[PDB]
From Swiss-Prot:
Domain of life from the UniProt record: Eukaryota
TM ranges: none
Protein name: Suppressor of disruption of TFIIS
Summary of the function given for this chain in its UniProt record: Could be an enzyme that inactivates 6-azauracil by modifying it.
Organismal lineage: Eukaryota, Fungi, Dikarya, Ascomycota, Saccharomycotina
Source species of the chain: Saccharomyces cerevisiae (strain ATCC 204508 / S288c)
CDD domains assigned: HAD_5NT
Alphabetized Gene3D superfamilies for the sequence: 1.10.150.450, HAD superfamily/HAD-like
GO molecular function, one term: nucleotidase activity
Family: Belongs to the SSM1 family.
Cystine residue pairs: none
């Protein structure tokens, strides 16, 4: 990644103190949000995860599918279950999974996306664009850099796989962490986009101003139906359509 030279190829916000309490923050999911689910990256991840269940838990493929979906469904991350019940080391799992995707051959600079996010930053209606992902920081950063958007965000809340289980979406504590890290004072000053219906559900219940459910094709049942109060779009470039006012001075 260090040989990338395109705009947005370098992270410009710190990773890892009172603030203006009127801060407005737009939280961005990453996987299947900042890139399309139709990249099939999610399918690549799942293949790798299923391989891990087989090689490390010694499960047949069908038992692997079932347990993976069960953990994913209850926790928002299979790895949460693997840590708690199977005493798996999440960083080693992560090394084999997310961190071994052929992303460099899949993700390329998304110029329309870059330009859309720039307009959102430049309206003055939103104070911070804050990343909020269940991925570990390695993968999250890699996605931003390849997509050419690593300079367009003010911070990153990611799931800390160092824990031995993980605080993650859709659990409330993950949202409380994003609020604290981003400097957000009230959920009312927050907006949120994510492809997972369950994640959006939590954002809505907590009192976030506007939550957008991003469903490129059909809903993944495991991730949840579109919840009540949510706005649905099929591509992140449709944000200008549904929260137009945030793009206007
Ligand atoms: Mg996502």
């Amino acid at each position: 990644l260090e040989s990338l030279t395109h705009p947005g190829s370098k992270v410009t916000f710190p990773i890892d103190t009172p603030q203006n309490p009127n801060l407005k923050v737009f939280f961005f999911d990453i996987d299947n949000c900042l890139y399309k689910s139709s990249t099939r990256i999610h399918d690549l991840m799942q293949q790798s995860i299923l391989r891990f269940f087989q090689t490390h838990l010694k499960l047949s493929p069908e038992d692997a599918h079932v347990l993976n979906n069960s953990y994913y469904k209850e926790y928002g991350l299979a790895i949460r279950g693997l840590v708690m019940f199977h005493k798996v080391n999440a960083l080693e799992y992560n090394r084999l999974v997310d961190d071994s995707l052929p992303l460099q051959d899949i993700l390329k600079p998304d110029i329309p996306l870059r330009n859309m996010l720039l307009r959102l930053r430049q309206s003055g209606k939103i104070d911070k664009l804050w990343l909020f992902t269940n991925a570990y920081k390695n993968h999250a950063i890699r996605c931003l850099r390849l997509l050419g958007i690593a300079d367009l965000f003010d911070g990153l809340t990611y799931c800390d796989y160092s824990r031995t289980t993980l605080v993650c979406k859709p659990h409330v504590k993950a949202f409380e962490k994003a609020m604290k890290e981003s400097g957000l004072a009230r959920y009312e000053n927050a907006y949120f986009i994510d492809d997972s219906g369950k994640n959006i559900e939590t954002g809505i219940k907590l009192g976030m101003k506007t939550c957008i459910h991003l469903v490129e094709n059909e809903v993944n049942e495991i991730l949840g139906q579109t919840p009540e109060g949510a706005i649905v779009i099929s591509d992140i470039l449709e944000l200008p359509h549904v929260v137009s006012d945030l793009f206007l001075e």
